[PDB]
Enzyme design. Structure first.
Site, PDB file in Angstrom:
ATOM      1  N   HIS A 110       0.810  -1.207   0.000  1.00  0.00           N
ATOM      2  CA  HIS A 110       0.000   0.000   0.000  1.00  0.00           C
ATOM      3  C   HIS A 110       0.852   1.270   0.000  1.00  0.00           C
ATOM      4  O   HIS A 110       0.643   2.159  -0.821  1.00  0.00           O
ATOM      5  CB  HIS A 110      -0.929  -0.010   1.221  1.00  0.00           C
ATOM      6  CG  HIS A 110      -1.861   1.163   1.288  1.00  0.00           C
ATOM      7  ND1 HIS A 110      -3.159   1.114   0.827  1.00  0.00           N
ATOM      8  CD2 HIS A 110      -1.674   2.423   1.752  1.00  0.00           C
ATOM      9  CE1 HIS A 110      -3.733   2.292   1.006  1.00  0.00           C
ATOM     10  NE2 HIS A 110      -2.854   3.104   1.565  1.00  0.00           N
ATOM     11  N   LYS A 152       2.827   6.031  -7.352  1.00  0.00           N
ATOM     12  CA  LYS A 152       1.845   6.819  -8.117  1.00  0.00           C
ATOM     13  C   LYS A 152       2.176   8.315  -8.139  1.00  0.00           C
ATOM     14  O   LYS A 152       1.971   8.984  -9.159  1.00  0.00           O
ATOM     15  CB  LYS A 152       0.416   6.632  -7.558  1.00  0.00           C
ATOM     16  CG  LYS A 152      -0.340   5.410  -8.097  1.00  0.00           C
ATOM     17  CD  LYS A 152      -1.449   4.942  -7.139  1.00  0.00           C
ATOM     18  CE  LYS A 152      -2.480   6.029  -6.820  1.00  0.00           C
ATOM     19  NZ  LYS A 152      -3.450   5.619  -5.746  1.00  0.00           N
ATOM     20  N   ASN A 153       2.658   8.841  -7.011  1.00  0.00           N
ATOM     21  CA  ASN A 153       3.021  10.263  -6.919  1.00  0.00           C
ATOM     22  C   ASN A 153       4.275  10.530  -7.738  1.00  0.00           C
ATOM     23  O   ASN A 153       4.318  11.470  -8.531  1.00  0.00           O
ATOM     24  CB  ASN A 153       3.287  10.693  -5.470  1.00  0.00           C
ATOM     25  CG  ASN A 153       2.041  10.665  -4.618  1.00  0.00           C
ATOM     26  OD1 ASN A 153       0.944  10.874  -5.122  1.00  0.00           O
ATOM     27  ND2 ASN A 153       2.202  10.422  -3.315  1.00  0.00           N
TER      28      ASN A 153
HETATM   29  N1  ADP Z   1       7.145  12.871  -5.531  1.00  0.00           N
HETATM   30  C1  ADP Z   1       6.383  13.961  -5.594  1.00  0.00           C
HETATM   31  N2  ADP Z   1       6.782  15.032  -6.406  1.00  0.00           N
HETATM   32  C2  ADP Z   1       6.002  16.166  -6.491  1.00  0.00           C
HETATM   33  N3  ADP Z   1       4.812  16.328  -5.828  1.00  0.00           N
HETATM   34  C3  ADP Z   1       4.434  15.254  -5.033  1.00  0.00           C
HETATM   35  C4  ADP Z   1       5.130  14.041  -4.849  1.00  0.00           C
HETATM   36  N4  ADP Z   1       4.474  13.203  -3.982  1.00  0.00           N
HETATM   37  C5  ADP Z   1       3.415  13.868  -3.677  1.00  0.00           C
HETATM   38  N5  ADP Z   1       3.292  15.122  -4.255  1.00  0.00           N
HETATM   39  C6  ADP Z   1       2.203  16.157  -4.133  1.00  0.00           C
HETATM   40  O1  ADP Z   1       1.532  15.806  -2.933  1.00  0.00           O
HETATM   41  C7  ADP Z   1       0.140  15.490  -3.201  1.00  0.00           C
HETATM   42  C8  ADP Z   1      -0.315  14.115  -2.963  1.00  0.00           C
HETATM   43  O2  ADP Z   1      -0.679  13.574  -1.715  1.00  0.00           O
HETATM   44  P1  ADP Z   1      -1.563  12.247  -1.795  1.00  0.00           P
HETATM   45  O3  ADP Z   1      -2.031  12.241  -0.383  1.00  0.00           O
HETATM   46  O4  ADP Z   1      -0.750  11.144  -2.284  1.00  0.00           O
HETATM   47  O5  ADP Z   1      -2.789  12.499  -2.842  1.00  0.00           O
HETATM   48  P2  ADP Z   1      -3.020  12.538  -4.438  1.00  0.00           P
HETATM   49  O6  ADP Z   1      -1.823  12.004  -5.133  1.00  0.00           O
HETATM   50  O7  ADP Z   1      -4.273  11.567  -4.738  1.00  0.00           O
HETATM   51  O8  ADP Z   1      -3.357  13.917  -4.879  1.00  0.00           O
HETATM   52  C9  ADP Z   1      -0.034  15.520  -4.728  1.00  0.00           C
HETATM   53  O9  ADP Z   1      -1.353  16.012  -5.049  1.00  0.00           O
HETATM   54  C10 ADP Z   1       1.162  16.288  -5.293  1.00  0.00           C
HETATM   55  O10 ADP Z   1       0.762  17.625  -5.523  1.00  0.00           O
HETATM   56 MG    MG Z   2      -1.321   9.481  -4.460  1.00  0.00          MG
END
Ligand code: ADP
Ligand code: MG
Ligand code: ADP
Ligand code: MG
EC number: 2.7.11.2
Lengths: 359, 359
Positions: free
Chosen positions: A234, A241-242
């Protein structure tokens, strides 16, 4: 007409944290649903009551929302649900098979809690606003609420999975949801592949993977550990995905698309997993907000991927952190405890201490 | 016999944070010691009084120590020292040249505060013990005390350096301690060389350096910024010393000695400097303690290198963080604000808010 009575009673006890070893011996040798049955009959009601006691002390403006009220009703019903077995006798091979069916029914009853609670967060945002204080309170409450839920679901999954019905397999690789010989890299690989699939379908382009292991004490032995593989999957999946989204979107007028590098290091007490990307990074100022429930409310949608993944890491004394370099990329690290001995449940408890954090 | 009166009075005002731009125009055009003189006459007494007001509310068991008492006497004398000019007239080219001499004398009077205060920390440790609570209190107090000191020394250095005596140079690269065109990589290189020298003399072996720049908006332009170079040097130097020690000591029965890699990235609001080493890393559990004054009390000795370097970064809205991989290495990151506009002094203030953090 006695739920308030039950709640106040079991609300007197503190939850009892189990170590990864106890969990292993619970399904291993001692393993006789009778032992588990007698344990869960008192433990579950103590854990349910403790989180319910906390909810009830929430401002009435939050309390009264359809969201909170609805969810609050499921927990009340689940409590009464398990109570039925407090006076029964476990030698009846039918008294405990009804406990198993009772658990599966309680688990699915709470299957949509996150979305439901999320709806209450959105209402509050439009009903009263999003100020640092209301955010801190919501964050404090949700982190505890959700951790508690993770711990309860762990107990229930261990019981239901372990006592499926008869010991045909007798002697397994896995003990319920726990893998005493989990190959970290393999799980990394799996979560990556699943994320890649989604990434390709939506962006029709996806970065590759590179994995590097660092076994400090044994230079070339593969890294294994005792852990709940679905939990690790998980966290890795949400992180992949991020990293993918960022990397792809930040190189659209570029042909190059750098890879996502993962490092798995094993030290004397820590087992660390670092995922490095080049998706442009984030300003230090906005990093704090990425773990917020309120502020964070295709691949991505809602904002529960990060905060909930962190709770999973914290559950067994670990952590999940993010450090970025605006204009370049981001490092996301999962900290786990290497030794099964240091792997003990982290559970929030209701005390005079937890009371004044809402003042 | 009126210091307590002065303290209580100026203790009514709040310090006034200056931006990097104001600092630049203070020595640039507006620059007429009269303007600075009139400013510092009220500002310094407000900053001195605020930190002194905080000290006086410390438990008497800390208050009464020779350490705290001695240091507390220097600040009382410095206050009275600057007071002398409250009623004077600045058109007298001699009234302000005595202010300059008065500042230089106050600066050197406080030159040994850190060591002195450190002695009080050690006494407390043996006199009452080292518990999480006393540690949190000391940490809270010292961080504010020291930040305040950094801000005061900044004002004094800007004045003394800028008004050395006559404007021969007239038009400079530097405006006191500030460099409007600071080349980050150059400072990295300097701190590295100084650390290497020490490392070679003590261990007769030292890792090499690799530097990589990432100018997001302008792919190959060298990274420059408006900053106080001596402050940046200090942080880099303390970090290089730790990285070197760790790398050397962790590869003693190895011939290989990996290099220290530094990356300088420039984004839209952040200018980040990451220093990566392979000195074995530290368990997540011990990382928290590395920034502690109490717990951290050749190359290394006392434990003020990290905590004080962080304060320097925070001084202009930046930060300094550490994330390690036990069994492999550590990443130390300095976060600075890219735009001179976002570069504003961060100053601790005495309020009812700062009062209850000691309860
Ligand atoms: N590796 C990364 N590089 C740039 N921005 C990131 C990264 N990981 C997360 N983020 C930012 O943080 C937020 C994501 O938090 P998350 O709780 O995973 O929700 P989601 O991806 O569904 O929007 C994203 O919307 C993005 O703007
Ligand atoms: Mg995410
Ligand atoms: N890069 C690093 N790798 C391993 N340990 C480190 C690193 N940086 C700092 N440390 C640890 O943190 C402590 C240093 O904090 P510091 O305040 O700089 O004091 P000092 O170096 O004089 O002991 C060290 O004593 C060392 O144990
Ligand atoms: Mg040091």
């Amino acid at each position: 007409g006695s739920a308030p009575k039950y709640i106040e009673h079991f609300s007197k006890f503190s939850p009892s944290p189990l170590s990864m070893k106890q969990f292993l011996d619970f399904g291993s040798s001692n393993a006789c649903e009778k032992t588990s049955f007698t344990f869960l009959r008192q433990e579950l009601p103590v854990r349910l009551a403790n989180i319910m006691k906390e909810i009830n002390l929430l401002p009435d403006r939050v309390l009264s929302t359809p969201s909170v009220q609805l969810v609050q009703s499921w927990y009340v019903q689940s409590l009464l649900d398990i109570m039925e077995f407090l006076d029964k006798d476990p030698e009846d091979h039918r008294t405990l098979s009804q406990f198993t069916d009772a658990l599966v029914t309680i688990r699915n009853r709470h299957n949509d809690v996150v979305p439901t609670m999320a709806q209450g967060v959105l209402e509050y945002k439009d009903t009263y606003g999003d100020d640092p204080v209301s955010n801190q309170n919501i964050q404090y409450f949700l982190d505890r609420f959700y951790l508690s839920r993770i711990s309860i679901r762990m107990l229930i999954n261990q019981h239901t999975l372990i006592f499926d019905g008869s010991t045909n397999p007798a002697h397994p690789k896995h003990i319920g949801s726990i893998d005493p010989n989990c190959n970290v890299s393999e799980v990394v690989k799996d979560a990556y592949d699943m994320a890649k699939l989604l990434c390709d379908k939506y962006y029709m382009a996806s970065p590759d993977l590179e994995i590097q292991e660092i076994n400090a004490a044994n230079s070339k032995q593969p890294i294994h550990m005792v852990y709940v593989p679905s939990h690790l999957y998980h966290m890795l999946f949400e992180l992949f995905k991020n990293a993918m989204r960022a990397t792809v979107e930040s190189h659209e007028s570029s042909l190059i698309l750098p890879p996502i590098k993962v490092m798995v290091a094993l030290g004397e007490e820590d087992l660390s997993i670092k995922m490095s990307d080049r998706g442009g990074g984030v300003p230090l100022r906005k990093i704090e907000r990425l773990f917020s429930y309120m502020y964070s409310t295709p691949l991505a949608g809602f904002g529960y991927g990060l905060p909930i993944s962190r709770l999973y890491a914290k559950y067994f004394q670990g952590d999940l952190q993010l450090f970025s370099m605006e204009g370049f990329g981001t490092d996301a690290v999962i900290y786990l405890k290497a030794l099964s001995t240091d792997s003990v449940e982290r559970l929030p408890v209701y005390n005079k201490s937890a009371w004044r954090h809402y003042q």
